[PDB]
């Protein structure tokens, strides 16, 4: 790998510089190099990995949605034929997006998840696994769509089971997991009632635990609770 010659600490340092410079592709490449050193990641390092790939795939997803919208309009009645170019370019972006998701899933499978024993690391990685299968599901249309959806579901479910046993209801990882699993239910699994129920129960159980928190932890938890509330307002 192109980062094989760089020290682990230098890769982490450069990932932080890349973030400051908004160079998210570089940041992801540095963090991939750091993971491939084979040591477990600290909490801060896990968050750098996540930020890097979330920003890369986020740009790809936004571009894919623009292109898919254009393609769908081209397929309406009365639309002038423009040739294969819209489909081709949507496919190009789609293939790049799938490659990034496969890269992340590959890091998780070789070998982040299997070495993650603490709840905070294991839930973090399983949530990531659910998220990147969810991004694959957003673009899937073929024989494997059901299996991709079930892979996302299974990863989220394992993360949920651990988080409910091992973490308080206000823990930000637990909250973000529940938020994303609720989005999965609504947008991927055609289960809006499940999405709504999960968001409401998550919000209410976190509300009841806020009294145990410091001011700083309260701020962290309430920020994510507000996203649950925003979704509930959209969905109801």
């Amino acid at each position: 790998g192109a980062m094989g010659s760089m020290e682990r600490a230098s890769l982490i340092q450069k990932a932080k510089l890349a973030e400051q410079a908004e160079r998210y592709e570089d940041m992801a490449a540095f963090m991939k190099g750091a993971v491939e050193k084979g040591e477990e990641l600290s909490c801060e390092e896990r968050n750098l990995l996540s930020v890097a790939y979330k920003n890369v795939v986020g740009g790809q997803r936004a571009a894919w949605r623009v292109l898919s919208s254009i393609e769908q309009k081209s397929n309406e009645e009365g639309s002038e034929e423009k040739g294969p170019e819209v489909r081709e370019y949507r496919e190009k972006v789609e293939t790049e997006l799938q490659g990034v998701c496969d890269t992340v899933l590959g890091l998780l499978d070789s070998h982040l998840i299997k070495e993650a024993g603490d709840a905070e690391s294991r839930v973090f990685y399983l949530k990531m696994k659910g998220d990147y299968y969810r991004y694959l599901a957003e673009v899937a249309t073929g024989d494997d769509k059901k299996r991709i959806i079930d892979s996302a579901r299974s990863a989220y479910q394992e993360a949920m089971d651990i988080s409910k046993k091992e973490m308080p209801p206000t823990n930000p990882i637990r909250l973000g997991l529940a938020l994303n699993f609720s989005v999965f239910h609504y947008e991927i699994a055609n289960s809006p009632e499940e999405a709504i129920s999960l968001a409401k129960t998550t919000f209410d159980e976190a509300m009841a635990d806020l009294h145990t928190l410091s001011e700083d932890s309260y701020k962290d938890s309430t920020l994510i609770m507000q996203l649950l509330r925003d979704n509930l307002t959209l969905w109801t």
């Binding site: 979330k54 998220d131 973000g176 994303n180 989005v183 609504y186 925003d230 979704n231 959209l234 969905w235």
Partner: peptide
């Protein structure tokens, strides 16, 4: 919908 930022 909003996911984790």
């Amino acid at each position: 919908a909003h996911s984790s930022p």
